[PDB]
Amino acid sequence: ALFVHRDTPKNNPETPFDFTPENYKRIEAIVKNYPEGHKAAAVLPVLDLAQRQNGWLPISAMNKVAEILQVPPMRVYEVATFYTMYNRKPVGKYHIQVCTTTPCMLRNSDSILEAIQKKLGIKVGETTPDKLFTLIEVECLGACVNAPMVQINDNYYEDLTPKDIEEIIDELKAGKIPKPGPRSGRFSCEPAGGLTSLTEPPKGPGFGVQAGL
Amino acid sequence: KTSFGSLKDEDRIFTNLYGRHDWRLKGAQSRGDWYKTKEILLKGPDWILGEVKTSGLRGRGGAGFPTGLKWSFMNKPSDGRPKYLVVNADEGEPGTCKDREIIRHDPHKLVEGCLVGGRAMGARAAYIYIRGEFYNEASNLQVAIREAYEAGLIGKNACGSGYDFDVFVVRGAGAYICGEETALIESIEGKQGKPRLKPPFPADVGVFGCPTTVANVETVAVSPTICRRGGAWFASFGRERNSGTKLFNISGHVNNPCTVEEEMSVPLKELIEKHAGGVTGGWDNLLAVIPGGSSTPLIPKSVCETVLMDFDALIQAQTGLGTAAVIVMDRSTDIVKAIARLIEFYKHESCGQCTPCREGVDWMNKVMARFVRGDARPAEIDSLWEISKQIEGHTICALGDGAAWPVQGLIRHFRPELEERMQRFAQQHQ
Amino acid sequence: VNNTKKWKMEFDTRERWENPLMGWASTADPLSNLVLTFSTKEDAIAFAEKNGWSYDVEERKVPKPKSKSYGANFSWNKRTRVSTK
Numbered sequence: 001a002l003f004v005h006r007d008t009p010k011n012n013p014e015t016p017f018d019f020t021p022e023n024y025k026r027i028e029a030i031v032k033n034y035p036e037g038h039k040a041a042a043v044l045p046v047l048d049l050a051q052r053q054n055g056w057l058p059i060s061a062m063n064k065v066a067e068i069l070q071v072p073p074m075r076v077y078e079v080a081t082f083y084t085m086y087n088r089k090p091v092g093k094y095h096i097q098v099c100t101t102t103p104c105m106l107r108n109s110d111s112i113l114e115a116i117q118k119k120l121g122i123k124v125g126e127t128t129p130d131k132l133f134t135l136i137e138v139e140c141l142g143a144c145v146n147a148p149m150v151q152i153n154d155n156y157y158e159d160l161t162p163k164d165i166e167e168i169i170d171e172l173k174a175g176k177i178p179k180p181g182p183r184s185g186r187f188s189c190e191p192a193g194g195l196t197s198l199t200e201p202p203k204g205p206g207f208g209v210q211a212g213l
Numbered sequence: 214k215t216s217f218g219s220l221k222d223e224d225r226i227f228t229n230l231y232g233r234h235d236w237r238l239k240g241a242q243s244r245g246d247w248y249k250t251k252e253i254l255l256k257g258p259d260w261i262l263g264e265v266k267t268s269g270l271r272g273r274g275g276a277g278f279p280t281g282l283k284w285s286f287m288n289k290p291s292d293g294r295p296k297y298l299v300v301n302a303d304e305g306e307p308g309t310c311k312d313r314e315i316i317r318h319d320p321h322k323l324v325e326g327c328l329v330g331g332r333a334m335g336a337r338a339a340y341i342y343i344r345g346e347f348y349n350e351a352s353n354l355q356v357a358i359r360e361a362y363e364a365g366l367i368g369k370n371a372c373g374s375g376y377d378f379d380v381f382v383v384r385g386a387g388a389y390i391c392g393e394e395t396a397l398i399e400s401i402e403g404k405q406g407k408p409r410l411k412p413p414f415p416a417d418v419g420v421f422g423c424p425t426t427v428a429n430v431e432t433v434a435v436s437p438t439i440c441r442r443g444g445a446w447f448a449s450f451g452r453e454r455n456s457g458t459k460l461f462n463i464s465g466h467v468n469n470p471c472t473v474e475e476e477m478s479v480p481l482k483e484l485i486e487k488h489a490g491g492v493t494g495g496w497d498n499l500l501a502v503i504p505g506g507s508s509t510p511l512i513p514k515s516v517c518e519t520v521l522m523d524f525d526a527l528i529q530a531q532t533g534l535g536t537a538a539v540i541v542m543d544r545s546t547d548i549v550k551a552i553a554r555l556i557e558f559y560k561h562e563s564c565g566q567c568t569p570c571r572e573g574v575d576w577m578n579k580v581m582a583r584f585v586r587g588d589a590r591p592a593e594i595d596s597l598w599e600i601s602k603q604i605e606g607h608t609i610c611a612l613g614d615g616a617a618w619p620v621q622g623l624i625r626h627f628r629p630e631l632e633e634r635m636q637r638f639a640q641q642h643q
Numbered sequence: 644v645n646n647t648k649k650w651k652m653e654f655d656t657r658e659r660w661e662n663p664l665m666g667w668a669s670t671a672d673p674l675s676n677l678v679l680t681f682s683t684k685e686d687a688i689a690f691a692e693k694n695g696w697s698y699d700v701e702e703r704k705v706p707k708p709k710s711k712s713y714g715a716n717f718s719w720n721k722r723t724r725v726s727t728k
């Protein structure tokens with residue numbers, strides 16, 4: 001929750017970080033996406049790649065990203081503290097992100113937050129003592145008609161009730177992986193009482209095309 | 214046409230909106246995408262920009278600027294620097310979840326829109342700035358872009374027209390301010406997503422200091438359909454200067470929260486009672502509706518009875534159309550708590566660059582948090598009005614406007630609820 | 644820059660010393676706090692020459708006009724890009 005750093009014995013500039021060689025080839029592919037002379041444009045994807053490899057960002061992933069892109073380390077520290085996905089503390093293995101903005105709050109995301117809390121025994125911001133779950137409270141995740149919903153490390157679990165999210169936490173404690181979708185009957189975003197549109201077969205190529213084209 | 218709405222499936226641009234068909238290339242070609250694309254690319258920039266100007270397309274990002282007039286700012290001879298189309302796929306707006314549906318379910322339509330819009334402005338490549346939380350959607354679009362490269366549709370000699378056009382995907386990292394066009398440009402360049410001042414406009418100095426148009430997913434994805442079906446077809450829908458179809462996100466306190474495509478100047482009551490299954494508890498249970506995502510001021514049930522869901526009817530209704538993300542609120546809602554949670558969003562999503570939003574959106578969160586409990590006096594309502602008017606029109610970008618406008622809508626339509634909240638606080642805590 | 648609008652006339656600083664009793668700054672200089680304000684240079688030169696004072700004149704140092712551009716912060720190929728904002 002702090003935006004200054006202090007060198008702890010588990011987070012210091014001599015904490016061992018290095019990319020795997022297949023991640024060096026991934027960083028080559030990332031840096032080739034941007035124009036020559038603008039290698040600093042790959043600060044966000046390579047830092048996300050370092051977080052995906054390591055689970056979180058020590059201050060050696062930031063220094064390695066500054067070392068392999070030839071940018072100042074302060075200009076990587078700015079990006080790492082600005083964006084709210086870069087975990088500068090070690091988070092749990094399943095990082096649960098409950099949305100509590102107004103379209104999810106109106107559809108009772110507080111009951112889901114309370115269900116996750118009394119299932120895990122933690123509160124907002126805490127990590128479980130076995131380092132499996134970190135429950136934080138996030139802003140709008142962009143799945144608003146599927147409210148209420150959480151995100152667990154990559155995956156959107158949508159249309160949730162307390163029973164649905166407790167079943168998800170059960171099968172995440174069981175070592176399995178759940179299916180990322182709406183936990184009600186519907187599939188992605190349609191009206192739940194059947195399709196109110198797009199029931200007819202779509203037309204295909206050549207339909208309605210103007211002349212001379 | 215005097216009555217709008219009731220849009221048929223032959224006029225829906227976003228077929229396979231619901232994921233009910235194959236999103237891949239063998240599905241997208243069988244629904245109409247990537248048809249006669251070489252003939253669109255070989256008719257030049259000026260024909261395509263004329264078909265976008267004639268169609269009356271306005272920007273679907275929330276500003277509503279005329280899209281053909283916007284894209285013709287790039288229609289100028291090169292000066293050595295490359296040109297870049299940039300697709301705004303951030304979509305951090307509360308209520309808004311439609312570009313997720315376009316990218317997740319119609320990705321080749323976004324790729325063909327990138328190709329057509331980049332040929333129209335003479336762009337070298339396309340950087341799609343997708344939301345970093347949309348990881349499955351990003352890999353979905355990446356499989357589609359690999360399918361469009363391996364079919365020769367983009368890349369070297371795109372669609373066999375003698376045009377070289379790359380399409381990139383840049384994943385964000387969790388900031389709502391990176392949906393603003395200059396801050397998105399700053400985030401592609403590898404910095405903090407902090408907006409630029411204008412001038413320079415991005416068509417002069419944009420991403421990497423090149424000429425650049427930033428455009429929404431939806432206004433890019435409808436452009437091949439506007440080219441194929443014609444501009445007059447797309448301009449036959451909605452009112453004049455409000456032309457076309459539109460994805461509407463109805464959420465909140467409705468029975469069936471949904472993404473739906475609908476004609477532009479549809480009534481809001483018809484949209485809710487037709488595609489969403491009504492307000493939870495009937496239309497008489499309606500308290501307020503935020504019409505277009507969080508940056509637009511709310512309008513109460515008396516305004517929502519006859520309002521039309523395009524730009525001009527909502528600007529005359531002292532609100533905005535925005536991303537057209539309909540948040541529906543019933544009479545069982547603490548509306549001051551909802552607008553306070555929305556202002557809490559706007560201070561946790563604000564890049565902190567200039568003084569009015571950085572200081573005043575936090576100070577509006579503190580005043581709204583006292584208004585929820587009632588720990589205030591009625592002079593502070595007009596005080597909060599003047600604070601919101603000091604933020605509005607004084608910031609670098611429009612997150613100050615988009616954080617001042619909900620406070621203004623709440624005060625303007627619900628001053629009596631604030632006053633009775635505070636006076637019952639006074640008569641039970643003193 | 645409101646304090647850089649007018650011409651001044653001060654004198655050479657003379658001895659200040661520690662008061663033995665209190666450590667205060669004593670002086671024997673009567674013209675030590677005398678500061679006169681003039682609108683132009685020629686008026687100050689005329690007031691110095693009129694009273695028999697020997698003077699030196701330092702010319703007004705105006706800041707030179709700078710070429711400012713917000714878009715130079717984001718150039719394509721020039722070094723004047725900003726690394727942050």
Ligand SMILES: Cc1cc2nc3c(=O)[nH]c(=O)nc-3n(C[C@H](O)[C@H](O)[C@H](O)COP(=O)(O)O)c2cc1C
Nearest residue numbers: 272273274276301304305392393394428429611612
């Ligand atoms: C705070 C803020 C957030 C924005 N977020 C988005 C967004 O998520 N998606 C989007 O398309 N436009 C967003 N915009 C609007 C853009 O600045 C810009 O108008 C748009 O992306 C491109 O123009 P267009 O509407 O013609 O497509 C946002 C604007 C502001 C001020």
Ligand code: SF4
Nearest residue numbers: 564565566567570608
């Ligand atoms: S309005 Fe707010 S979010 Fe935008 S540049 Fe200013 S402080 Fe940043």
Ligand code: FES
Nearest residue numbers: 099104141142143
């Ligand atoms: S409000 Fe929770 S996802 Fe948009």
